[PDB]
Design a protein around this ligand. Structure first.
Ligand SMILES: [Cl-]
Ligand SMILES: [Cl-]
Length: 221
């Protein structure tokens, strides 16, 4: 596998969005993964609707602004036959009436693939071969809230009890040795002002830190 990967440098990733006061990170992680897979398929980067997921995927088990899971979102897109664009179905950060319109759909998936649970090397392989990957993580720490630079490492992090969905857009390392001071490149949904332009470097090959490889998946387009 490559020593480092960053799909942002290849055009697969939209600018950082902001879920605001709605527990919809699962939806942003899902649209993020879908955006990259659709780009791989068509060469066009089109921002996708998190509000369409929030409003319409309760049947698949999501709970709108009160939480959800990326796999259930990819399941909804499959069963639904489509997903609208961000422009056509804008984000308002509150649970609303499902207004899915097929004519505005710009994405589809046939289901999703799960990364072997808990294996950072499996996640490394998925990231290098597929594109950005949706992952769950333990983000319940002030250290994460006020993260700004460096490789994030939090001793109180859990690899099993997760509360936030994010997007792995690559991986890398500091220095000249590709085999140490490694990190996962993670896109968050708390706006570009949070973290490092909306991103965070999370310690990689440090025992599945914060659960990054516990529940990773990607849509099949
Ligand atoms: Cl999930
Ligand atoms: Cl940057």
């Amino acid at each position: 596998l490559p020593k480092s990967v960053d799909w942002r440098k290849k055009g697969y990733v939209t600018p950082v969005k902001n879920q605001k006061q709605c527990g919809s990170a699962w939806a942003f992680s899902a649209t993020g993964a879908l955006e990259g897979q659709m780009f791989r398929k068509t060469g066009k980067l089109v921002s996708l609707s998190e509000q369409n997921l929030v409003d319409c995927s309760r049947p698949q088990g999501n709970q709108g602004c009160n939480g959800g899971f990326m796999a259930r979102a990819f399941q909804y897109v499959k069963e639904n036959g489509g997903l609208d664009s961000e422009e056509s179905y804008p984000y308002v950060a509150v649970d609303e009436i499902c207004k899915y319109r097929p004519e505005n759909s710009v994405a589809q998936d046939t289901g999703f693939t799960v990364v072997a649970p808990g294996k950072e090397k499996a996640l490394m392989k998925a990231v290098a071969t597929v594109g950005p990957i949706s992952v769950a993580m333990d983000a319940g720490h002030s250290s994460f809230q006020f993260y700004k630079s460096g490789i994030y490492f939090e001793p109180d992090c859990s690899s099993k009890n997760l509360d936030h969905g994010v997007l792995v857009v690559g991986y890398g390392f500091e220095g000249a040795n590709s085999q140490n001071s490694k990190y996962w490149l993670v896109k968050n949904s708390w706006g570009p002002e949070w973290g490092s332009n909306g991103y965070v470097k999370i310690a990689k090959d440090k025992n599945n830190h914060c659960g990054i490889a516990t529940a990773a998946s990607y849509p099949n387009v």
